[PDB]
From a paper:
In the widespread xre-res system, the encoded Xre (Xenobiotic response element) protein contains a putative HTH DNA-binding domain that is stabilised in a higher-order structure through interaction with the associated RES-domain protein. The two proteins are expressed from two-gene operons that have been classified as toxin-antitoxin (TA) systems, which are widely distributed cellular regulators in bacteria that encode a protein toxin that inhibits cell growth along with a cognate protein antitoxin that neutralises it. The crystal structure of a Xre-RES complex from Pseudomonas putida revealed an unusual 4:2 TA stoichiometry in which each of the RES domains of a central toxin dimer interacts with a dimer of Xre antitoxins, thus generating two complete HTH domains. The HTH domain of this Xre antitoxin (XrePp) is structurally similar to the bacteriophage lambda Cro repressor and could thus potentially play a part in transcriptional regulation and toxin control through binding of the antitoxin to the TA promoter region, as observed for many TA systems. The RES toxin has an ADP-ribosyltransferase fold and expression of an orthologue from the insect pathogen, Photorhabdus luminescens, has been shown to result in efficient depletion of intracellular NAD+ in E. coli, suggesting that the RES toxin is a NAD+ glycohydrolase (NADase).
To get a molecular understanding of the interaction between Xre-RESPp and promoter DNA, we determined the crystal structure of the Xre-RESPp complex bound to a 30 bp dsDNA oligo covering the S4 element to 2.7 Å (R/ Rfree = 22.8%/ 26.9%). The structure contains four complete heterohexameric (4:2) Xre-RESPp complexes and four DNA duplexes in the crystallographic asymmetric unit. In all molecules, one Xre dimer of each Xre-RESPp complex interacts strongly with two adjacent major grooves on dsDNA. The interaction between the Xre dimer and DNA causes the major groove on the opposing side of the double helix to expand from 11.8 Å in canonical B-DNA to 14 Å. Significantly, we observe that the Xre dimer is asymmetrical in the way it interacts with DNA and overall approaches the double helix in a different way than classical HTH domains such as the Cro-repressor. More specifically, the angle between the helical axis of DNA and that of the recognition helix of the outer Xre molecule is 61.4° while it is 57.5° for the inner Xre molecule. Several residues in Xre, in particular Arg60, Arg67, Thr68, Lys70, and Arg72, interact tightly with C13, C20, and G21 on the (+) strand, as well as T7, T8, T9, and A14 on the (-) strand of S4 DNA. The dominant interactions are centred around the conserved Arg67 of the innermost Xre, which engages in hydrogen bonds to the N3 atom of T9 of the DNA (-) strand. Interestingly, Arg67 of the outermost Xre displaces A14 of the (+) strand and forms hydrogen bonds to the N3 of C13 (+).
Numbering used by the authors:
A (entry chain A): 1 to 144
B (entry chain D): 1 to 145
C (entry chain E), D (entry chain F), E (entry chain B): 1 to 149
F (entry chain C): 1 to 148
Write the structure that this text describes.
Amino acid sequence: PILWRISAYADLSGTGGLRVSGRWHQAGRPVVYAATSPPGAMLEVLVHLEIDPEDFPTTMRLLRIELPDTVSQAQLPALQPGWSAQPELTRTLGNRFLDDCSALLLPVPSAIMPSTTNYLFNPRHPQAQSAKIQVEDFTPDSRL
Amino acid sequence: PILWRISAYADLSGTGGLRVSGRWHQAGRPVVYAATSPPGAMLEVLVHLEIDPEDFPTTMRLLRIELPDTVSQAQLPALQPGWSAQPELTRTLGNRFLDDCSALLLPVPSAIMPSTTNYLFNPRHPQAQSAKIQVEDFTPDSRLF
Amino acid sequence: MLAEVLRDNGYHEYRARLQALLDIPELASDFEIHTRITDGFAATWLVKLTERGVLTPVERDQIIPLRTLKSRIERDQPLTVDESDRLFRSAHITAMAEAVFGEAGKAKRWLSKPKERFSGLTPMQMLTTQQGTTQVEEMLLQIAEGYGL
Amino acid sequence: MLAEVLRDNGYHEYRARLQALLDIPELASDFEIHTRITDGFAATWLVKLTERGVLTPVERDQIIPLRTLKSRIERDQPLTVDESDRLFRSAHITAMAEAVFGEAGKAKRWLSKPKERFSGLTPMQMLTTQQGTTQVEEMLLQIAEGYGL
Amino acid sequence: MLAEVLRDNGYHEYRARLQALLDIPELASDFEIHTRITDGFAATWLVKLTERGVLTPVERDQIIPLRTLKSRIERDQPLTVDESDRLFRSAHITAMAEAVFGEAGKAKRWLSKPKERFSGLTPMQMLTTQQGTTQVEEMLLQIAEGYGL
Amino acid sequence: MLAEVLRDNGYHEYRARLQALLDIPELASDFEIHTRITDGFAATWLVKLTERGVLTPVERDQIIPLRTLKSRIERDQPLTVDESDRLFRSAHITAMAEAVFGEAGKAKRWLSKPKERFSGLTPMQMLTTQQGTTQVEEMLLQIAEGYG
DNA sequence: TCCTTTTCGGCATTTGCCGAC
DNA sequence: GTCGGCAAATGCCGAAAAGGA
């Protein structure tokens, strides 16, 4: 299907995970956080990074990622209530998905919206070469 | 085809459109605004209605709307740049779609995010009964407010 | 018309909040409301409202100047029709916001925060004119109906 | 804009009538209208309106007493926010009734004569409050839609 | 290192902003930066920074009390290692924020606004400890890398 | 947050040692660490760290002068935010080095040995600036990458 | 050589009155 | 009315030589 990323970089290297941690990973692994919708990614970034729309960075880029439907994705274990406040658990699960190198994608639930699914993208997986990326520019009719 | 709405009511009547207008319609017609993704609807509401998460209404509800594949859609004309600041034009096109009653759904672009498509829903089309609605609750692992 | 838009319990809750805030019966007709406004509200009600933290001092001054209010209360005078209409505007907007938002803190907060739709003015500051009050009403109904596109 | 956008093609006619009554452009935004009200309307416009036959001296003094009007015209200060707001309410329902009835004469006759709904009060008097203004607007809307009984 | 994650483009941006803010050449090595901090900084530079609106007076006080800085400038003494380190933390967080956000205004606003992650503290208030500065860096890099979930 | 770059169990070992060095709970948040630094650490803990040989007397003097320390102890005052900041820097680098080398002895020796990259300065001397602390962390991570 | 003990010199900055916006 | 600054004596910081292992 189609995934959406919001980041200063227009690649899928995800090298910042080698020295920066997140909710779904510990520093030292390359990783890319993506969403299923541009509003999804934008809302996640605005809420969790605490950015006001008047302070939205001008270096930020929206990247559309297209993958074939044959790609491999790993299933996340069932999550009991409280996981949104247990970063150790989510970081451990993401680290296990990344180091096992079993699949290219990991669907995870959103912590701010129900029925919303974000995705973990492992660039070290060999299927990360079939990704086609293009930047979708923010137009004056697409402001915040 | 699944649509997502955020409103204080758990129906598809849209009667409030008979008194208050939006970006895509003028008052006097019933209409339902919806998004293709719950974060889409949430971002639209929060940005255009200027609601901080600490003031998010308790009355608000998130509705999943399931429609059959035979549902009818309309096509919006080619918009020229700058339409996000021309509410009269958007209201004109939405009023035209709602009055012609030619289709149930109208795909419209978003004024917030590129490549994002919101939807107008006409509750007076004969296909509005085929809609199945359900409320998605806000759990503390799926909340921002 | 309002009771047609405010569905479920919105209108009932709005009338209950008006009864609490302005001693206006829930079953009173709109003409009864207009007559009550023309008859004049007591200044004691206004000072009780600002004491209980319903209105801020700047909002009370928007309703009526402090010197004029003290004159009215020490003369055992009801408020004038324009002062009563300003206070009614405040109470109406507060009750409508509490009906749409579902609780008191969220409503008053949203009413007390600047908006880019108002060029950085708060909805309570928009309550100086008929037009600003109707704009606040329109925003509240857009919130209730989900017109966020 | 609360209850004046409910007519087919009547909204632009209402805005044109309002532009004739007050210097308020057809394309001016609602926040611009609020700032025009808060900037203060000129009393010269008010005396010109009551001269041109759209406001009677009693309807003029309902907006501002004659003494205060002389004070404004002499000392050269525009109408206060409350006086300008009353003038705007007057011009607003006048433009609305003109858009509804299609002519100024029948609109003025309807606005100036008492109506039973209001227990023997003219719609121009109902402009003393937010509620009475809304009632006049609802009545005009019912007339415009072709409602029966 | 910081450049590895910071993308030589953005890293050059950060070094340019740091040179403009603290007169540290953009080609100096990290040990050179450490030495410049240990050698001390001129109080003249701090008063120029606060006069150019780069640092708020309360931020200047967080770096060093005013009377102490006056003693420094009178004695023509360089800043102590801890004062110079506070100054470097301030300017370095400012440079990284300007490199990530692309504009100085947005960066300073984001640094001056309270954060729920910091229990209602601004990032500039986090610069009193090594761990707080590190948390601010982590947040900036999370913004830059798109770790928004 | 370069301590998080440590592999497998490193960070956990880093938090255990840091808990033994400065009584910082292993699952405490980074903001809680900031709060502990701002509230000030007990000077008695610093004196005990010197007594147990965790710090050398010159290292303690660099953290806080001795007269000032005795004043803190008598007046029953926690350490200031910058004295506590230097103490935290010392304990943090010590715990990181102990997690990299796996033993207090080698770690303390490597921390007290001058380095060419630092113009003949020891890593413990590099803990006077944010940049020097970052350089020490980077060197520790370089060592841990190519284990040595 | 390495480190401590205390002396008051001397640095540092509160604290309240008084200016700028 | 808020935010910011100025300067005196209370108060803090720690230097420095002399002493101890």
